[PDB]
Amino acid sequence: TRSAVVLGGGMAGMLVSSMLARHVGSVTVIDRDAFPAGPDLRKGVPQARHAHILWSGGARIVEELLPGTTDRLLGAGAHRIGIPDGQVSYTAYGWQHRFPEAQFMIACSRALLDWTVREETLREERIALVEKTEVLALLGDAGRVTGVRVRDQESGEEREVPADLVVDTMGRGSPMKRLLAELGLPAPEEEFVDSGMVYATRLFRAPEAAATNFPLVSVHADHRAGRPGCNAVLMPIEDGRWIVTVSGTRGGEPPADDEGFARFARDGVRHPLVGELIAKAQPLTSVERSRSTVNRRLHYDRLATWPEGLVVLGDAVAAFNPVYGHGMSAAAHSVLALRSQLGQRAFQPGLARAAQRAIAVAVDDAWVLATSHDIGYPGCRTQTRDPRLTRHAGERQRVTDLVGLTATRNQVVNRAAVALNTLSAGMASMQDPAVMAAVRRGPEVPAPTEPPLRPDEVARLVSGAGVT
Ligand SMILES: Cc1cc2nc3c(=O)[nH]c(=O)nc-3n(C[C@H](O)[C@H](O)[C@H](O)COP(=O)(O)OP(=O)(O)OC[C@H]3O[C@@H](n4cnc5c(N)ncnc54)[C@H](O)[C@@H]3O)c2cc1C
After folding, report:
1. Pocket of ligand 1 contains residue 169 by CB under 6 Å
2. Could you tell me which of 170, 165, 122 has the C-alpha nearest to residue 20?
3. How many CA atoms within 13 Å lie on the side-chain side of 332?
4. Top-level class of domain 3-47+111-190+294-369
5. Which residue has its alpha carbon closest to ligand 1 atom 3?
6. Which of 459, 378, 55, 51 is nearest to 196 (CA)?
7. Which terminus of the chain is more solvent-facing, meaning fewer CB atoms within 10 Å of its CB: N or C?
8. Is 322 in the pocket of ligand 1 (CB under 6 A)?
9. What are the residue ranges spanned by the domains of the chain?
10. Residue 272, Cβ neighbours under 10 Å: how many?
């Protein structure tokens, strides 16, 4: 028997549905949007206009739950950029020397990634996708949730969809607070770190030579400096295009005009690299800024009471800054925290209280890595009580500076760094006796004085057809 219901159809909803469908009978995915039968931009996912990094940890977790996604993505035009052999990033501590492949990423427009995860998840006959359907209230009481009360927007007919487990994958704009309040509970301990970052993405047609096999280029800010931090990223996607993304916090926001965007990429960031790489490229669209870039975590886990059958994961319990790129891996890791809680307790009481506390730990790494750098920015309003950001947050800032400073010129420290920053290990793995010893060993390669671009990569920026 057993029956689940997943609210939302995003990266979180599809993933958790592909894991639940192997643990229950029927999975009913509810959403209020129009899902397209073709990698097109959607209104429920407006982030799809800006590029989305899928780190290794989230990549091989999507692959585990959706076999055949990586190769299908890699066949539609997505690249498997290695790390740090396929990235030319100006870190806060210098240029990242391009060591051999330690971890990897998946670079593609979010519209494709959401599709390749959707059409692969919907291959199971038990998952029933229900589009254009608003959610009104949760069915049950304050001790057990039994389903949802939805209503179609095209017909207006109300109904009662019940299930043994209600999953909330309703993005950053999760009305969970409203749905829970009507159920009869208090408000969760809201915690947020608001740096005020302002995204600014604009597509770029890569040169004909650099359509395939081009490295993830980025110029990062110095979180130890007193200036408003501002980054700039140039990752390649499908169909031979380039996503150029600039960012900035409260005080150094990027402009809206197209003519000013090409300036911020080379006259606002700490190095004018990307601004030179976009002068080799054909602009397509305009600047489509997004301001919903504020780490916000709602600790449902520490509530005094929690109903049975209700689980919240994705961007509904913990959403983070997009300049670091952990949103998808935190959701993927959260799904595995529910799975690693469904095999122990089955469908017994305590599932919700144990799956929420497990989801709490799953995103804890994606919550420190995000906020630990944002707290040091100017005029950032933060409402947080965890001591790792208040007191003795200097030691947490004094060590991370050292690890990141050595990782630029030390393989062992780098291979252990991107195994954590790309959510592929734990924060305890950075206390390895062979990592603390490699930090004390010091740099092993000189700091590059120029962008560590390979000649066979820079030569891929011009067509060269105007010569005999
Ligand atoms: C600008 C930007 C850039 C980002 N960049 C990155 C990045 O580089 N790397 C990374 O890892 N993460 C990134 N993220 C985060 C990433 O988008 C999210 O972490 C991820 O989408 C989480 O999936 P989700 O299903 O929880 O939310 P979503 O993917 O947003 O899914 C929400 C779903 O719920 C539905 N829904 C919403 N409201 C309702 C409602 N009232 N009723 C019914 N259904 C509803 C929507 O239609 C949608 O299907 C970025 C986010 C933004 C905004």
Report:
1. yes
2. 165
3. 22
4. alpha beta
5. 322
6. 378
7. C
8. yes
9. 3-47+111-190+294-369, 83-101+196-291+391-468
10. 15
